[PDB]
Amino acid sequence: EIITLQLGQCGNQIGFEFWKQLCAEHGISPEGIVEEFATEGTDRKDVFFYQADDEHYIPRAVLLDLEPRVIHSILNSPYAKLYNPENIYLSEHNNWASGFSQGEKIHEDIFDIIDREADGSDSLEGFVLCHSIAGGTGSGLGSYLLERLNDRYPKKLVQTYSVFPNQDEMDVVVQPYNSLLTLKRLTQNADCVVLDNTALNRIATDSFSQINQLVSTIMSASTTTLRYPGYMNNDLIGLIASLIFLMTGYTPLTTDQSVASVRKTTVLDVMRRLLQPKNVMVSTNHCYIAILNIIQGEVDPTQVHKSLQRIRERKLANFIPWGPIQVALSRKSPYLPSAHRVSGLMMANHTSISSLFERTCRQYDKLRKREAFLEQFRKEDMFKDNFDEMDTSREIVQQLIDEY
Amino acid sequence: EIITLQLGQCGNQIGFEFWKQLCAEHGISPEGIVEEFATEGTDRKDVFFYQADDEHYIPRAVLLDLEPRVIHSILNSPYAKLYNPENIYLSEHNNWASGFSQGEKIHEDIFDIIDREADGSDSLEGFVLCHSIAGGTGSGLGSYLLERLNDRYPKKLVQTYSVFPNQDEMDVVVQPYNSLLTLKRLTQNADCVVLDNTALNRIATDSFSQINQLVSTIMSASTTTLRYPGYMNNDLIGLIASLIFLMTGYTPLTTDQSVASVRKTTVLDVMRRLLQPKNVMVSTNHCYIAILNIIQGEVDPTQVHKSLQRIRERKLANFIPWGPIQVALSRKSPYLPSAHRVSGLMMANHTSISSLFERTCRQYDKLRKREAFLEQFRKEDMFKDNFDEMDTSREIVQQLIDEY
Amino acid sequence: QFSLRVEILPSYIPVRVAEKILFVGESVQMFEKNQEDTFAAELHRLKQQPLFSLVDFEQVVDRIRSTVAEHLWKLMVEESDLLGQLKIIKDFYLLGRGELFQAFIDTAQHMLKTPPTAVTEHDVNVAFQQSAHKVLLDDDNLLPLLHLTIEYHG
């Protein structure tokens, strides 16, 4: 089992479309009813859903937000009735310090909800977090929740889908501070999926609805095998151990109109495609640390071995000199059309990601020398006296970059 | 069997809606007739009702009041004909002393009615009292009746649903005196359910009709197993022995419009919910003395054992260091819809209740130093000479607080 | 009430079918269409076989067994309602209706702490009868069928 903590407008939407994808996959009706064709289903549902006496299924989700508008719109959707009104929380009434201050203020009810959800699962495995690191809501609230959660639950995993601000595009003027602080908290508490609007929209090209549909696709494909038990990799901890910051790529990212080119898609061509920098959805002979490829559809392990052999000989990849990939196979949901003969998802750890922080650090250093937009931060208690928090966070990020 | 003594406007209403709930549960028509579908009923009716030669059932209730208006309205309700006109009593023509003086004045007819009702039951078990402690009517009249009843019937139980005045809201200006005196009498004569408008309306939020509907729900759920015989806890004395001041909480306190969220409701989640201070309908490492949870609907004792084990390990509760809970199961009435898969009611004794009196004492001490609103009290005979009654009552309450 | 014999039972015949025979018959003697003649043809058929084949002896017994058992279950549940009767045993034997006993214990208490004599047997049957009426259980059925016993003088 698992819980999802989605914050800010970004996280709220991310959750909306993630649950849309899930209910599509598992044959769950918008109202929580189960379709007749899926009555005898074999798919495991406990992982993301828990059924109710009324036979309906409820997501293990909690909605958090500093503002009402987004969730109010969500509850006007056809999927509104599905969620649990008890879990959803809205502030009665764009800065990280303010977000953390509110988090300190509203500890009690949030952790009440989290405890209630936790006690309903026998074998909870970890946590899932969806949020954006730039905006005031996501950054600060995620920081506070991560801190108090790692404190509260020292034996549960914490996984996040953190969305990083666009850089080529000059959105949050105060983004460097929030990003740097959120990164501090991620290193200091997060167990383990980086995301950026820049490269994501780049691949989308070459509305937020479609972008986050792709993101939800990534999340669902990541959790597929856990959802669909097989032989190997039957747990999230198995995933994490096989890799341990990450980046992702998915081959069949094709529009509903781009099915006309039914290209004979082997496993070799897919696994190859997952390697190119173009497909890496995120934007010094930098090299890899780990690679995992989850493959959906018919697959012959002989083909997998041949592809691995050929790629190894062709040396299209580079590895650490000081240490000695993985190809897991799953089964598609029996419901969604198998427009793709075989499909592939890749999650990897690669040193080049360091550059991200070097940019943000460069951004942050490009402001701290002139004290820009610190007036609001001084208002909150945390930065009321000084900003030693900022210095510690910057040095922590520098240490991480040095370690990479 | 049992008798109900309801005083003051509060008690009169409380009784109205309590009997409404009872007749709804047992399939008793508003006029006292029995519905065709309930002809072969198995539910025990003697406990709260006695049938009549005309086949109608009459409650074992007595109406008392210093004023006519409330009961006159009651007798204009569709339920008017149900009650016994003989038992109902109305004064022909807001202070505790006046109430007790009248009680001394109208001893004869009240005890005539009580004796008549008592002699109609073979195995009367105790008494039930519903009243408010602030207003003049309820406080004084209940005091007098409790005194003369404990004197008259030294072998019957005396149970009360005492409503305490709101404190956050500044209603009876002379409330401290009436409350303190009623508490004196309760300690000195009452066998055994505290109630406050503040927290009750708080939970209602988060007219008197709905508040007292909830209160009647609490009373009926408390008396369920007695009404519906089973294996264990087949008597009120069994209830009292298993606990012995109290506070209460009920999980499925859901509006008629809030059934849309049909949440899969185990026994574990319910019994857990009954523990939180939020659900405790009333408003130094204070701890518990006793806990009882009555559960309605399908229940597996294995689930109960598992819930008890897990809660014990999670140590969500605190107990006295000097002494070594209880979970009883009942069956729902076969008539009212089972909108809840399993439901839970909790009655507990907890030391924190002491604070209540500390407030009222603080209130009373905040007046006795300046002799506020004593003019009316001096009028009555009881406080005609002095107010030693007040001093004794205050010291008794102080002794009780020290004992806690 | 019949029995079975082992000291005279054949050798090659297993006891399993012997038990099957003992039940299929007693279920008729106690019990006092087409399911009668057809089996007579089956038994007669075996008399023509020039070799006793146990593997076939059971295929005629078990069908006869399952038919009477199916016919007996039809009566033991549908016609003669067992559920109602079991519901009576759970209530009174296993203290299912405990609310009746707490009153009976409340009344018939002083008359049992004393050692038992020849008169206490009736001194309780009345108190138990006073009890069922005291819980407004009015049913002349199944009321006289319950008779408390007093193991006196041995």
Short mmCIF file of N, CA and C in Angstrom, two decimals, chain A residues 51-54 56 85, chain B residues 261-265 341:
data_model
loop_
_atom_site.label_atom_id
_atom_site.label_comp_id
_atom_site.label_asym_id
_atom_site.label_seq_id
_atom_site.Cartn_x
_atom_site.Cartn_y
_atom_site.Cartn_z
N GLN A 51 -11.41 -0.46 -1.06
CA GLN A 51 -12.83 -0.56 -1.38
C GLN A 51 -13.67 -0.17 -0.17
N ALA A 52 -14.94 0.11 -0.43
CA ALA A 52 -15.87 0.54 0.60
C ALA A 52 -17.06 -0.41 0.66
N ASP A 53 -17.75 -0.38 1.80
CA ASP A 53 -18.92 -1.24 1.98
C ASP A 53 -19.92 -1.06 0.85
N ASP A 54 -20.03 0.14 0.30
CA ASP A 54 -20.89 0.40 -0.84
C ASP A 54 -20.33 -0.15 -2.14
N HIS A 56 -17.82 0.72 -3.68
CA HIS A 56 -17.00 1.71 -4.37
C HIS A 56 -15.59 1.69 -3.80
N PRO A 85 -14.27 13.17 0.79
CA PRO A 85 -14.38 14.54 1.31
C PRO A 85 -13.69 14.73 2.64
N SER B 261 -21.05 9.71 1.14
CA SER B 261 -19.73 9.11 1.36
C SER B 261 -19.95 7.82 2.14
N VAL B 262 -20.23 6.74 1.42
CA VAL B 262 -20.40 5.44 2.05
C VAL B 262 -19.00 4.87 2.25
N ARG B 263 -18.37 5.26 3.35
CA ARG B 263 -16.99 4.87 3.62
C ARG B 263 -16.97 3.48 4.21
N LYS B 264 -16.11 2.62 3.66
CA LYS B 264 -15.99 1.27 4.19
C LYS B 264 -15.60 1.38 5.65
N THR B 265 -16.52 1.03 6.55
CA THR B 265 -16.39 1.31 7.97
C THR B 265 -16.19 -0.01 8.71
N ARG B 341 -22.43 0.42 7.81
CA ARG B 341 -22.09 -0.99 7.86
C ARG B 341 -21.86 -1.45 9.30
#
